[PDB]
C-alpha cells in the first residue's frame, strides 16, 4: 500500500512548504502582520494530508502486498468474500430530510424547528446505524 | 395547512397571498400527483416482494468468484434445486423479511 500513502505525502511536502513560505513572506512584505486567515488554512491543510497521509504509512508497514498492489496478479488471487454492503435502505432519504429540516430551522431561525430537526436526525441516524443489527421480535 | 397560513406567512416567510394560491392550485394538483406516486409506490412494493421470493433475501456479502463474477449470496427462504437456483415460492399476503438479521442471523450478545 505504498503509492496510496505516497499520494498524500507528496501533498504534505508542498502544503507544509507553502504554509511556511506564505507565513514568512507576509511577515516581511504584507502591509500588516502575518496574514492570519490564509496561513491558518495552509497550516491546517497540511494537517489534512498528514492525518490521512501518515495513517496509510501504518497501513503500509503493517499490511503486506495485497493483490491490488502486485504487478502481475492473476484474477483468481483475491477470490474470497468482499464483505457486507447494504443492498437497499430507505434511511438515507430520511437523514437528508432530517438534516434539511434542521437547516430550514437554522435559516428561518426557528428554535423549535431546529430542536425538532435535530431529534429527527438522531432517530434517522439511529435507524441507519442499527439497521443491520436488530434480531427478530421476541414477542 | 391552509388554515394556518397566517403562521406560514409570518414564521416561514413566504407571503399571505402566495399561500392561498398554493392552496388553490394545489387543491387540484397535489391530490392528483399523490394518486400517481402512491399507485406506483404500491406496485413497486409488490415487485420488491417478488424479488425476495424468486431470488431470495438479498444478503450483503459479495464473494468475488475465481474468474471475476461479483455475486450477492442470496438466502433462498425455501427449498433448493439440485442447481443453485431456488424454487420460487408463492405470495400469500404475509410480510416477507428483507434483511438477514431479522431471520435470526444476528445471534445473542452474551447474557
Amino acid at each position: 500500500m505504498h503509492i496510496e500513502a505516497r499520494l498524500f505525502e507528496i501533498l504534505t511536502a508542498f502544503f507544509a512548504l507553502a504554509a511556511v513560505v506564505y507565513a514568512v513572506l507576509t511577515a516581511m512584505f504584507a502591509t500588516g502582520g502575518v496574514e492570519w486567515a490564509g496561513t491558518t488554512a495552509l497550516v491546517l491543510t497540511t494537517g489534512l494530508t498528514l492525518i490521512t497521509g501518515t495513517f496509510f504509512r501504518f497501513v503500509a508497514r503493517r499490511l503486506d502486498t495485497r493483490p491490488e498492489d502486485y504487478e502481475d496478479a492473476e484474477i483468481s488471487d483475491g477470490a474470497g468474500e468482499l464483505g457486507f454492503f447494504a443492498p437497499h435502505s430507505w434511511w438515507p432519504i430520511l437523514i437528508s430530510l432530517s438534516f434539511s429540516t434542521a437547516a430550514v430551522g437554522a435559516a428561518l431561525w426557528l428554535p423549535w424547528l431546529i430542536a425538532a430537526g435535530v431529534a429527527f436526525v438522531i432517530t434517522s441516524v439511529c435507524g441507519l446505524v442499527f439497521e443491520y443489527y436488530w434480531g427478530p421480535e421476541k414477542h | 395547512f391552509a388554515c394556518m397560513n397566517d403562521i406560514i406567512a409570518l414564521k416561514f416567510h413566504i407571503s399571505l397571498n402566495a399561500t392561498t394560491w398554493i392552496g388553490r392550485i394545489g387543491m387540484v394538483v397535489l391530490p392528483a400527483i399523490v394518486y400517481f406516486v402512491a399507485y406506483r409506490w404500491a406496485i413497486s412494493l409488490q415487485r420488491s416482494d417478488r424479488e425476495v421470493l424468486e431470488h431470495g433475501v438479498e444478503t450483503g456479502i459479495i464473494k468475488r468468484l475465481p474468474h471475476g463474477a461479483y455475486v450477492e449470496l442470496h438466502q433462498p427462504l425455501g427449498p433448493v434445486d439440485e442447481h443453485g437456483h431456488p424454487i420460487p415460492l408463492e405470495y400469500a399476503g404475509a410480510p416477507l423479511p428483507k434483511r438477514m438479521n431479522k431471520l435470526g442471523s444476528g445471534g445473542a450478545p452474551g447474557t
Partner: peptide, 30 residues
Amino acid sequence: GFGPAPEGMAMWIIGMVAAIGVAMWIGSRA
C-alpha cells in the same frame, strides 16, 4: 407562540409518536 397550531404539532410528534411507538413495543409485527 400559542394557539391551536403548536398544539397540533406538539400532539402528532410527541403524543402520537409516543402512543404508536408504545403500541409497536407491546404488539407484534405480522
